[PDB]
Amino acid sequence: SYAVAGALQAAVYQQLRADAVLAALVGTAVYDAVPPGPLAGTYVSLGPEDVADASDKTGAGAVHDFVISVITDAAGFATAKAAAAAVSDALVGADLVLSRGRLVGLWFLRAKARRVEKADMRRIDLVFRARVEG
Amino acid sequence: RPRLNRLLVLEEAVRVADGAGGHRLDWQAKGEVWAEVTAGSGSERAGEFVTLASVPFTIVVRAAPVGAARRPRPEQRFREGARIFRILAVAERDREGHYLSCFAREEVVA
Numbered sequence: 001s002y003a004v005a006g007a008l009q010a011a012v013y014q015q016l017r018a019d020a021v022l023a024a025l026v027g028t029a030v031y032d033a034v035p036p037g038p039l040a041g042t043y044v045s046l047g048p049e050d051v052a053d054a055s056d057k058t059g060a061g062a063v064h065d066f067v068i069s070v071i072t073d074a075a076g077f078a079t080a081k082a083a084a085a086a087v088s089d090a091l092v093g094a095d096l097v098l099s100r101g102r103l104v105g106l107w108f109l110r111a112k113a114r115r116v117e118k119a120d121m122r123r124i125d126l127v128f129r130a131r132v133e134g
Numbered sequence: 135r136p137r138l139n140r141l142l143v144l145e146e147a148v149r150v151a152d153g154a155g156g157h158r159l160d161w162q163a164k165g166e167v168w169a170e171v172t173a174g175s176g177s178e179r180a181g182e183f184v185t186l187a188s189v190p191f192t193i194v195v196r197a198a199p200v201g202a203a204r205r206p207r208p209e210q211r212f213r214e215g216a217r218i219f220r221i222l223a224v225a226e227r228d229r230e231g232h233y234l235s236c237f238a239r240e241e242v243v244a
Contacts, residue, residue, distance in 0.1 A: 034184045038216060039243035045183040071182050075149065076156010116182055123182055 001051055002062040004132040007099035012066070012106075012130075013046055015090055022086035025079075026070075041073035042080075044087065054131060064130040065109060069123050077113075077122035084111070084124055091128055103132040136194040136233055138168040142212040142219065161211070164203060169195045169212075169236070171219075184243050191219060191238035197231055206236055 009032070016030045017023065022044075029043035045068070052063035068087055072080040094106035106128060113124035143166050147159040174190025193212065198204035205224070206212075212219035219238035227233045 034243055036243055038218070039184060039186070039241070047183065069183065074156065075159055076152060076154055078152050078154035078156050079158075081154075121182055 003134045004062055004101040005049060005064055008064055008130055008132060011096045011098050015096060019090040022083060025083050025086055044068060044070045061133040064132060065127050068126045071121055071123050073121060080122055080124050084126055087126055101132055101134045103130055106130050136170045138170055140169060140171055142167055142169050142214050144206055144210060145213055146210050167195050169193050186241040187244035188239050188241040191240050193236035193238055195234050195236060197234050
């Protein structure tokens, strides 16, 4: 990663769990590190980033196509699509504040949505682009 | 022949359908059955973004004809307290048909 991405994940995690919806759909189950226990089963997960270095002569920036996946164990997955509807409106047009550097925009990209393991879990990825500035 | 020593709550989820072709699961409790649970070799498994912890757990209940509530179906699950045993299949151990083989996972997220 570049210098910003340590604080970019800390900002897009704190923008979640303060959004009013998805505190009523997913609950407290927004985490990178999944805590030990019984695995609630409608969680979201925010880790797999990748950077693209949109830089210049004066300073440097980056383009983060970070992935926020929504997992559900429900029978259908209109539960996950309702949960990622709550993910995406919390992030597009972010106006976040970072700890190191700035971001200028948080857009949306590809969002694959398929059946993952043994046709039982339903995971829907959400790729968001974050053009940041170091 | 099995020593049915452990008590397991059979659980069937009633399937309320939603708008988009799927169902909603709530897992109300069915009756309680007695069964022996025999662990297989357990190890971690790469989950989705979890590091799960699974064990084979062949579970032996008494049998019933197929149109009865005492038959565990593979869409059901067991529960001893807060330990969710899934059911993979049921498979009729004995030649006479006295007992069944349930197959569980019991994957805690570790």
